[PDB]
Amino acid sequence: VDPRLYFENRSKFIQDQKDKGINPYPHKFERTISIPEFIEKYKDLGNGEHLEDTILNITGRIMRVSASGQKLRFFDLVGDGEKIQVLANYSFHNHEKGNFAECYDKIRRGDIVGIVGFPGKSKKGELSIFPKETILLSACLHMLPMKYGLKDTEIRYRQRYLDLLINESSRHTFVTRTKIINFLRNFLNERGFFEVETPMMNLIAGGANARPFITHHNDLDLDLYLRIATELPLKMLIVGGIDKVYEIGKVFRNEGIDNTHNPEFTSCEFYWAYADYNDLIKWSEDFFSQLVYHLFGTYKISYNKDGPENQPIEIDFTPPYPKVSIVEEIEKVTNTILEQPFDSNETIEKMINIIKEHKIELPNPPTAAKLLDQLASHFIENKYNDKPFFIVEHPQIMSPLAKYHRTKPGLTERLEMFICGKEVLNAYTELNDPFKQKECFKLQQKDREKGDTEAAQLDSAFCTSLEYGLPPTGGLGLGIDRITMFLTNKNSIKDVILFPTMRPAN
Amino acid sequence: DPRLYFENRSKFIQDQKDKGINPYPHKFERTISIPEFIEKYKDLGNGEHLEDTILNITGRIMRVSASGQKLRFFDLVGDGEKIQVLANYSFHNHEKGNFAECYDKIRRGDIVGIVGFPGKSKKGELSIFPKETILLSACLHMLPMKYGLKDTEIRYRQRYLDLLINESSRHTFVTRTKIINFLRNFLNERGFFEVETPMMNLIAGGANARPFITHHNDLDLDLYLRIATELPLKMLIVGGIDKVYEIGKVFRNEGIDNTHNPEFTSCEFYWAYADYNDLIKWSEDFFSQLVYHLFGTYKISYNKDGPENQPIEIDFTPPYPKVSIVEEIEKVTNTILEQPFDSNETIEKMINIIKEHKIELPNPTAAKLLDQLASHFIENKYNDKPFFIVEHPQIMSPLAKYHRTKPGLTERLEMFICGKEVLNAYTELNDPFKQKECFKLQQKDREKGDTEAAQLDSAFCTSLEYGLPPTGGLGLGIDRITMFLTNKNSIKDVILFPTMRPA
Ligand SMILES: O=C1O[C@@H](CC2CCCCC2)Cc2cc(O)cc(O)c21
Ligand SMILES: O=C1O[C@@H](CC2CCCCC2)Cc2cc(O)cc(O)c21
Ligand SMILES: N[C@@H](CCCC[NH3+])C(=O)O
Ligand SMILES: N[C@@H](CCCC[NH3+])C(=O)O
């Protein structure tokens, strides 16, 4: 009933041990077997069968406490996601080491224990460790929460260690997460790609449309920005001759937090010399179809799109995926023509009016790209939940770094894969002409002058590298935390990050 | 003069745009790479042409030469390998353009798309014989030669130029990536689990270092970049992930030199039920197996005093020497450092030792004092082999478990190559009551003006109360390890883009 008193009592227990000799936090307990190795080694065992001649050293944490009297104690020992029962029988206690009840009366739920004992099955067939001696390695001073206590509470986030022990689903989630990354690292390695590291602190934060973080180095007396993307120095490396290059790492964007946006998230971006939009389309279908089959043995997975209570939709990752041109589909759904230039007063007022007619949010500032972006967000982004699908060939006012379309004026060779209306992949044929790049950086600075503080600044060091000749390349970005959300059936980005960014408890 | 060169090539590109031809074509389908090309056709004798194999080649032209008007030669470099291109007036497809006009425009550094056949020259240099050559992306500047990158900062700002000219820089970052590749699989074979902890936190803990500050606007919240991955990894051990690690960047806001870049790559792992001794063997196993994986031997050549002096042989054969820090300082300085080490007297004693040896007084707490004594009297004891500094005082190690038999010390180890700290490990402190004792001690030395004194994480202290099992944790400095395995005397030579001033 009273956790504050429970913790105050256990604190006295630890100090009462030190006064009366014992050390409650010993340095080393040489373990002999792990609990998973234990279950494998002795699961194929008969009912009631003991092997009291094989003595083993095993560790773990107590998570269930019960007793069938003063002479038989029952526990649940967990370790590495698995579990065995501890069957402490008074007959098998090494009495030279201490009194049976005095030893086990101290055990509480959460205690980390070292056990010397032998393996066997119970009468009912429960595979158990049968201790000869049990020594406390690291006591748990607090009361562990119940599964109910964490269900719709933020303790999973602020106290992830509780979530990792109590909920089996949590360990499963993050084991899947690093399997997603393990797949992608080798998927690129087996294809001749070269993993690198580009700085996260920069004089200018380019590569995306987002407000950055700013820090300060004292000894240099220099203001550095946290990277919002890895796009530019990776393209500088293609110039350097590394024709197959990529990076898996954290990027930082100082903007709103919600179920799809954590301030720091993991991205992967690879750059592929002598590849284009089509290769990036085929790559995205190849990788996602194989990523999903690698984890599930199927191409169709089910996802609770509307939360856990409501029924799930089924997502079919089987290639090929639908391709939807952003301008012409917005055209069709709205029955209008977006005349070019898309950034003209006529086309901007037009889009303002169709945003106003449908009572959709007006973006501030009403830049032409944000109008198009909200139009695409409100009209084409949730077109398919049955499968992933590509929104392609964005106008050049939206894609300052994408190469212009080879047969469609004003558009780019850009693609974007969505799952359940959530952007998960960004790719395009790279804009490799320094003459046309400055015009998209100087037009972005004027967009910056209108209050669009996401409008990309002028990186000069990157512009100079374009002047030594960037070969025709194709680059693609992956939002890893979002891929993990869908592939682990979680509705929040806080559920696929170990320690998400939270409002402080003060 | 370069300025005129860039402007001619700049005007040259605009001429092509007005003249009709696209100077930056969208797509050239390559059939074969330059590495595959050498592998596929290395064995051809001097003079043979397979005129039937019409191939599509890519690369960067890095040499221009001619023999009259009908013969043109270039060096096509790609993926670190180089082949010849022999353009001859007979094989040229005259339907696509004039021979001389097509090839007079190609200059050193240009990205081209060649369609031709494989063959070896009369002198026997493996060549590609184009029927048609297309400029895919032009080099507008003048690329320097190898000497243009010697006495300059250019390698660090324009790493792409260094990678394109100095063939050794490409070897170093391949080695850097192979180092990390080996370490990840070394841990993964032993059941370790890779995670990613926050880089922005309410508190910067896990090391004795001053952090960077930043601000998240929507939350109106100041956040510190992580100086270590230590504390959030240990709370994951509490969560039941007994073999956890993270290979990533950490940020420390201090001075820059040849072994300090404000952001650097570390690897920390945490191994429950292991100890000071298990980590000692892990370090010896890993560094011996890593060296052998790279070099086929346990002995390395490293120019400790630069390429202008004779190098030394680093023998990574295990085991490595272990040296106690307080014991050795006391022997080498012929003094007695008494406990408490942060007592006024032995603080005054260490200060006087530094004074009569004429060493610089650290901005003078006992832990900073001890660190200075170790740096000048211990840390260069062994250069021919890596060695461990062990059993540090707890005054220095607030997160390390106290030594089980040596009072005042901890079960800590630091490994050094050529006097550079490259590894840090100890038996983790898991008694939460001793932890807050050590964190409150850091605040007293923080009150004396220590920017690098650890502030207490209340989240982390609460974590140990739920029970942190006996654990041994270790930390690697990836960049510094990369330096010694690539024979580099600066950390900037192993970081693709080191932190530097604006141009
Ligand atoms: O995860 C995210 O996805 C990216 C979008 C992602 C699409 C694929 C290419 C890389 C970028 C956008 C974003 C913003 C933010 O402030 C926080 C976040 O977690 C994310
Ligand atoms: O390279 C470095 O190594 C680490 C020391 C290294 C020892 C082994 C464990 C990981 C940390 C110290 C350091 C500080 C700094 O501000 C910039 C830097 O580049 C380095
Ligand atoms: N850096 C991009 C991803 C790669 C786009 C294609 N080069 C982004 O932030 O979305
Ligand atoms: N975080 C430590 C490395 C790990 C030490 C053992 N937990 C450091 O910065 O040196």
PDB file of C-alpha atoms in Angstrom, chain A residues 154-332:
ATOM      1  CA  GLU A 154       4.317   7.582 -19.424  1.00  0.00           C
ATOM      2  CA  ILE A 155       6.411   5.387 -17.110  1.00  0.00           C
ATOM      3  CA  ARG A 156       7.368   3.287 -20.147  1.00  0.00           C
ATOM      4  CA  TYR A 157       9.161   6.386 -21.452  1.00  0.00           C
ATOM      5  CA  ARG A 158      10.551   8.058 -18.325  1.00  0.00           C
ATOM      6  CA  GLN A 159      11.501   4.699 -16.734  1.00  0.00           C
ATOM      7  CA  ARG A 160      12.160   2.373 -19.694  1.00  0.00           C
ATOM      8  CA  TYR A 161      13.828  -0.201 -17.415  1.00  0.00           C
ATOM      9  CA  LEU A 162      10.481  -0.931 -15.758  1.00  0.00           C
ATOM     10  CA  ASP A 163       8.933  -1.350 -19.212  1.00  0.00           C
ATOM     11  CA  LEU A 164      11.729  -3.699 -20.303  1.00  0.00           C
ATOM     12  CA  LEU A 165      11.220  -6.099 -17.374  1.00  0.00           C
ATOM     13  CA  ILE A 166       7.435  -6.011 -16.965  1.00  0.00           C
ATOM     14  CA  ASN A 167       6.174  -6.054 -20.568  1.00  0.00           C
ATOM     15  CA  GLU A 168       7.336  -8.875 -22.829  1.00  0.00           C
ATOM     16  CA  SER A 169       6.196  -6.805 -25.824  1.00  0.00           C
ATOM     17  CA  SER A 170       8.824  -4.125 -25.129  1.00  0.00           C
ATOM     18  CA  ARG A 171      11.932  -6.293 -25.417  1.00  0.00           C
ATOM     19  CA  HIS A 172      10.384  -7.752 -28.585  1.00  0.00           C
ATOM     20  CA  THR A 173       9.977  -4.255 -30.044  1.00  0.00           C
ATOM     21  CA  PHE A 174      13.593  -3.137 -29.681  1.00  0.00           C
ATOM     22  CA  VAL A 175      14.965  -6.547 -30.663  1.00  0.00           C
ATOM     23  CA  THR A 176      13.008  -6.082 -33.895  1.00  0.00           C
ATOM     24  CA  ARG A 177      14.372  -2.530 -34.173  1.00  0.00           C
ATOM     25  CA  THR A 178      18.031  -3.538 -34.340  1.00  0.00           C
ATOM     26  CA  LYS A 179      17.056  -6.383 -36.672  1.00  0.00           C
ATOM     27  CA  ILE A 180      15.677  -3.693 -38.988  1.00  0.00           C
ATOM     28  CA  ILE A 181      19.019  -1.881 -38.808  1.00  0.00           C
ATOM     29  CA  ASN A 182      21.048  -5.099 -39.037  1.00  0.00           C
ATOM     30  CA  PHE A 183      19.147  -5.927 -42.230  1.00  0.00           C
ATOM     31  CA  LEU A 184      19.753  -2.513 -43.786  1.00  0.00           C
ATOM     32  CA  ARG A 185      23.470  -2.373 -42.938  1.00  0.00           C
ATOM     33  CA  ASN A 186      24.094  -5.726 -44.638  1.00  0.00           C
ATOM     34  CA  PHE A 187      21.594  -5.059 -47.451  1.00  0.00           C
ATOM     35  CA  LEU A 188      23.854  -2.131 -48.360  1.00  0.00           C
ATOM     36  CA  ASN A 189      27.115  -3.931 -47.532  1.00  0.00           C
ATOM     37  CA  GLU A 190      26.266  -6.925 -49.733  1.00  0.00           C
ATOM     38  CA  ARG A 191      25.622  -4.423 -52.556  1.00  0.00           C
ATOM     39  CA  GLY A 192      29.036  -2.772 -52.277  1.00  0.00           C
ATOM     40  CA  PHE A 193      28.064   0.296 -50.233  1.00  0.00           C
ATOM     41  CA  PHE A 194      30.503   1.999 -47.856  1.00  0.00           C
ATOM     42  CA  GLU A 195      29.398   3.053 -44.372  1.00  0.00           C
ATOM     43  CA  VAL A 196      30.857   6.392 -43.210  1.00  0.00           C
ATOM     44  CA  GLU A 197      30.352   9.086 -40.562  1.00  0.00           C
ATOM     45  CA  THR A 198      29.653  12.748 -41.342  1.00  0.00           C
ATOM     46  CA  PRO A 199      29.642  15.429 -38.615  1.00  0.00           C
ATOM     47  CA  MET A 200      26.554  16.235 -36.581  1.00  0.00           C
ATOM     48  CA  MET A 201      27.846  19.705 -35.622  1.00  0.00           C
ATOM     49  CA  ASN A 202      28.021  22.014 -38.639  1.00  0.00           C
ATOM     50  CA  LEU A 203      28.521  25.655 -39.566  1.00  0.00           C
ATOM     51  CA  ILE A 204      25.325  25.395 -41.653  1.00  0.00           C
ATOM     52  CA  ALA A 205      22.489  22.860 -41.337  1.00  0.00           C
ATOM     53  CA  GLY A 206      21.413  21.866 -44.842  1.00  0.00           C
ATOM     54  CA  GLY A 207      19.857  18.875 -46.547  1.00  0.00           C
ATOM     55  CA  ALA A 208      16.217  19.368 -45.532  1.00  0.00           C
ATOM     56  CA  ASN A 209      13.542  21.964 -44.778  1.00  0.00           C
ATOM     57  CA  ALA A 210      13.564  22.187 -40.985  1.00  0.00           C
ATOM     58  CA  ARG A 211      14.635  24.489 -38.155  1.00  0.00           C
ATOM     59  CA  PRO A 212      17.941  23.316 -36.573  1.00  0.00           C
ATOM     60  CA  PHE A 213      19.476  23.228 -33.111  1.00  0.00           C
ATOM     61  CA  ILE A 214      22.405  25.541 -32.359  1.00  0.00           C
ATOM     62  CA  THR A 215      25.282  24.940 -29.949  1.00  0.00           C
ATOM     63  CA  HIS A 216      28.553  26.695 -29.116  1.00  0.00           C
ATOM     64  CA  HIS A 217      32.162  25.542 -28.888  1.00  0.00           C
ATOM     65  CA  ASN A 218      33.864  27.613 -26.192  1.00  0.00           C
ATOM     66  CA  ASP A 219      37.526  27.286 -27.189  1.00  0.00           C
ATOM     67  CA  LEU A 220      36.849  28.022 -30.864  1.00  0.00           C
ATOM     68  CA  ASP A 221      34.242  30.685 -29.955  1.00  0.00           C
ATOM     69  CA  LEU A 222      32.178  29.311 -32.812  1.00  0.00           C
ATOM     70  CA  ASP A 223      28.477  28.594 -33.327  1.00  0.00           C
ATOM     71  CA  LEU A 224      27.734  25.123 -34.712  1.00  0.00           C
ATOM     72  CA  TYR A 225      24.383  23.708 -35.805  1.00  0.00           C
ATOM     73  CA  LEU A 226      23.219  20.143 -35.279  1.00  0.00           C
ATOM     74  CA  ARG A 227      22.687  18.339 -38.571  1.00  0.00           C
ATOM     75  CA  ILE A 228      19.098  18.182 -39.814  1.00  0.00           C
ATOM     76  CA  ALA A 229      20.176  15.652 -42.485  1.00  0.00           C
ATOM     77  CA  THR A 230      23.281  13.937 -43.831  1.00  0.00           C
ATOM     78  CA  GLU A 231      22.520  14.779 -47.458  1.00  0.00           C
ATOM     79  CA  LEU A 232      25.249  17.287 -48.316  1.00  0.00           C
ATOM     80  CA  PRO A 233      28.551  15.840 -46.958  1.00  0.00           C
ATOM     81  CA  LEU A 234      27.467  12.452 -48.309  1.00  0.00           C
ATOM     82  CA  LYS A 235      27.085  13.998 -51.767  1.00  0.00           C
ATOM     83  CA  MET A 236      30.451  15.684 -51.214  1.00  0.00           C
ATOM     84  CA  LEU A 237      31.812  12.166 -50.699  1.00  0.00           C
ATOM     85  CA  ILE A 238      30.461  10.931 -54.042  1.00  0.00           C
ATOM     86  CA  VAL A 239      32.592  13.698 -55.544  1.00  0.00           C
ATOM     87  CA  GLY A 240      35.418  12.203 -53.477  1.00  0.00           C
ATOM     88  CA  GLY A 241      35.149   8.976 -55.478  1.00  0.00           C
ATOM     89  CA  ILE A 242      33.217   6.796 -53.025  1.00  0.00           C
ATOM     90  CA  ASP A 243      30.500   5.922 -55.532  1.00  0.00           C
ATOM     91  CA  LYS A 244      28.577   3.752 -53.031  1.00  0.00           C
ATOM     92  CA  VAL A 245      28.225   5.615 -49.732  1.00  0.00           C
ATOM     93  CA  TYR A 246      25.758   5.824 -46.845  1.00  0.00           C
ATOM     94  CA  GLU A 247      25.279   6.764 -43.193  1.00  0.00           C
ATOM     95  CA  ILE A 248      23.091   5.398 -40.378  1.00  0.00           C
ATOM     96  CA  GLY A 249      22.746   7.880 -37.559  1.00  0.00           C
ATOM     97  CA  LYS A 250      20.869  10.474 -35.560  1.00  0.00           C
ATOM     98  CA  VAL A 251      19.617  13.759 -36.999  1.00  0.00           C
ATOM     99  CA  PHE A 252      18.122  16.648 -35.060  1.00  0.00           C
ATOM    100  CA  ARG A 253      15.221  18.930 -35.963  1.00  0.00           C
ATOM    101  CA  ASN A 254      13.894  21.607 -33.598  1.00  0.00           C
ATOM    102  CA  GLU A 255      10.177  21.520 -34.375  1.00  0.00           C
ATOM    103  CA  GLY A 256       6.969  20.067 -32.972  1.00  0.00           C
ATOM    104  CA  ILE A 257       6.791  16.783 -31.074  1.00  0.00           C
ATOM    105  CA  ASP A 258       3.993  14.288 -31.688  1.00  0.00           C
ATOM    106  CA  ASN A 259       3.386  10.582 -32.307  1.00  0.00           C
ATOM    107  CA  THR A 260       5.506  10.756 -35.491  1.00  0.00           C
ATOM    108  CA  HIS A 261       8.139  13.383 -34.580  1.00  0.00           C
ATOM    109  CA  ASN A 262      10.827  12.970 -31.927  1.00  0.00           C
ATOM    110  CA  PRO A 263      13.434  15.776 -31.806  1.00  0.00           C
ATOM    111  CA  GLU A 264      16.257  13.284 -32.444  1.00  0.00           C
ATOM    112  CA  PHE A 265      15.549  10.371 -34.778  1.00  0.00           C
ATOM    113  CA  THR A 266      17.620   7.861 -36.721  1.00  0.00           C
ATOM    114  CA  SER A 267      17.844   8.262 -40.487  1.00  0.00           C
ATOM    115  CA  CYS A 268      19.651   6.273 -43.152  1.00  0.00           C
ATOM    116  CA  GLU A 269      20.735   7.908 -46.401  1.00  0.00           C
ATOM    117  CA  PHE A 270      22.659   6.201 -49.197  1.00  0.00           C
ATOM    118  CA  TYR A 271      24.033   7.778 -52.362  1.00  0.00           C
ATOM    119  CA  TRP A 272      24.426   5.740 -55.532  1.00  0.00           C
ATOM    120  CA  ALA A 273      26.602   6.980 -58.379  1.00  0.00           C
ATOM    121  CA  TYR A 274      25.134   6.519 -61.876  1.00  0.00           C
ATOM    122  CA  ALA A 275      21.653   5.695 -60.603  1.00  0.00           C
ATOM    123  CA  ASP A 276      18.437   7.666 -61.010  1.00  0.00           C
ATOM    124  CA  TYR A 277      14.794   7.937 -59.923  1.00  0.00           C
ATOM    125  CA  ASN A 278      13.921   4.575 -61.487  1.00  0.00           C
ATOM    126  CA  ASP A 279      16.723   2.732 -59.682  1.00  0.00           C
ATOM    127  CA  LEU A 280      15.599   4.351 -56.426  1.00  0.00           C
ATOM    128  CA  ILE A 281      12.023   3.227 -57.091  1.00  0.00           C
ATOM    129  CA  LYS A 282      13.179  -0.343 -57.720  1.00  0.00           C
ATOM    130  CA  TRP A 283      15.505  -0.208 -54.705  1.00  0.00           C
ATOM    131  CA  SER A 284      12.662   0.874 -52.416  1.00  0.00           C
ATOM    132  CA  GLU A 285      10.413  -1.964 -53.596  1.00  0.00           C
ATOM    133  CA  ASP A 286      13.240  -4.514 -53.402  1.00  0.00           C
ATOM    134  CA  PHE A 287      14.338  -3.546 -49.895  1.00  0.00           C
ATOM    135  CA  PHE A 288      10.962  -3.114 -48.189  1.00  0.00           C
ATOM    136  CA  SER A 289       9.522  -6.321 -49.656  1.00  0.00           C
ATOM    137  CA  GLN A 290      12.590  -8.209 -48.417  1.00  0.00           C
ATOM    138  CA  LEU A 291      12.783  -6.368 -45.091  1.00  0.00           C
ATOM    139  CA  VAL A 292       9.215  -7.409 -44.266  1.00  0.00           C
ATOM    140  CA  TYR A 293       9.645 -11.009 -45.418  1.00  0.00           C
ATOM    141  CA  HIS A 294      12.923 -11.234 -43.482  1.00  0.00           C
ATOM    142  CA  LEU A 295      11.100 -10.548 -40.202  1.00  0.00           C
ATOM    143  CA  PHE A 296       7.716 -12.197 -40.791  1.00  0.00           C
ATOM    144  CA  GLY A 297       7.989 -14.746 -43.597  1.00  0.00           C
ATOM    145  CA  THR A 298       5.146 -12.884 -45.310  1.00  0.00           C
ATOM    146  CA  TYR A 299       4.503  -9.744 -47.324  1.00  0.00           C
ATOM    147  CA  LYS A 300       1.199  -8.882 -45.615  1.00  0.00           C
ATOM    148  CA  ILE A 301       1.415  -7.658 -42.022  1.00  0.00           C
ATOM    149  CA  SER A 302      -1.415  -6.309 -39.888  1.00  0.00           C
ATOM    150  CA  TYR A 303      -1.198  -2.857 -38.310  1.00  0.00           C
ATOM    151  CA  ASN A 304      -3.531  -1.293 -35.734  1.00  0.00           C
ATOM    152  CA  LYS A 305      -3.864   1.995 -37.597  1.00  0.00           C
ATOM    153  CA  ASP A 306      -6.608   3.340 -35.302  1.00  0.00           C
ATOM    154  CA  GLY A 307      -5.009   2.364 -31.993  1.00  0.00           C
ATOM    155  CA  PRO A 308      -4.979  -0.906 -30.052  1.00  0.00           C
ATOM    156  CA  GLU A 309      -8.684  -0.980 -29.183  1.00  0.00           C
ATOM    157  CA  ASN A 310      -9.946  -0.656 -32.765  1.00  0.00           C
ATOM    158  CA  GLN A 311      -9.535  -3.337 -35.414  1.00  0.00           C
ATOM    159  CA  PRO A 312      -6.345  -3.443 -37.512  1.00  0.00           C
ATOM    160  CA  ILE A 313      -5.820  -2.912 -41.210  1.00  0.00           C
ATOM    161  CA  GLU A 314      -3.633  -5.236 -43.282  1.00  0.00           C
ATOM    162  CA  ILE A 315      -0.585  -3.779 -45.052  1.00  0.00           C
ATOM    163  CA  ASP A 316       0.605  -5.627 -48.170  1.00  0.00           C
ATOM    164  CA  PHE A 317       4.262  -4.867 -48.954  1.00  0.00           C
ATOM    165  CA  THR A 318       4.282  -6.927 -52.164  1.00  0.00           C
ATOM    166  CA  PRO A 319       5.912  -5.066 -55.087  1.00  0.00           C
ATOM    167  CA  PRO A 320       5.270  -3.100 -57.131  1.00  0.00           C
ATOM    168  CA  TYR A 321       3.743  -0.208 -55.211  1.00  0.00           C
ATOM    169  CA  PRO A 322       1.349   2.381 -56.677  1.00  0.00           C
ATOM    170  CA  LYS A 323       2.976   5.545 -58.020  1.00  0.00           C
ATOM    171  CA  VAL A 324       0.951   8.756 -57.750  1.00  0.00           C
ATOM    172  CA  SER A 325       2.172  11.989 -59.327  1.00  0.00           C
ATOM    173  CA  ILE A 326       1.603  14.736 -56.780  1.00  0.00           C
ATOM    174  CA  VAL A 327       0.530  17.581 -59.075  1.00  0.00           C
ATOM    175  CA  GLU A 328      -1.755  15.628 -61.412  1.00  0.00           C
ATOM    176  CA  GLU A 329      -3.477  13.723 -58.596  1.00  0.00           C
ATOM    177  CA  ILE A 330      -4.123  16.938 -56.669  1.00  0.00           C
ATOM    178  CA  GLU A 331      -5.417  18.144 -60.037  1.00  0.00           C
ATOM    179  CA  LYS A 332      -7.822  15.215 -60.361  1.00  0.00           C
TER     180      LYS A 332
END
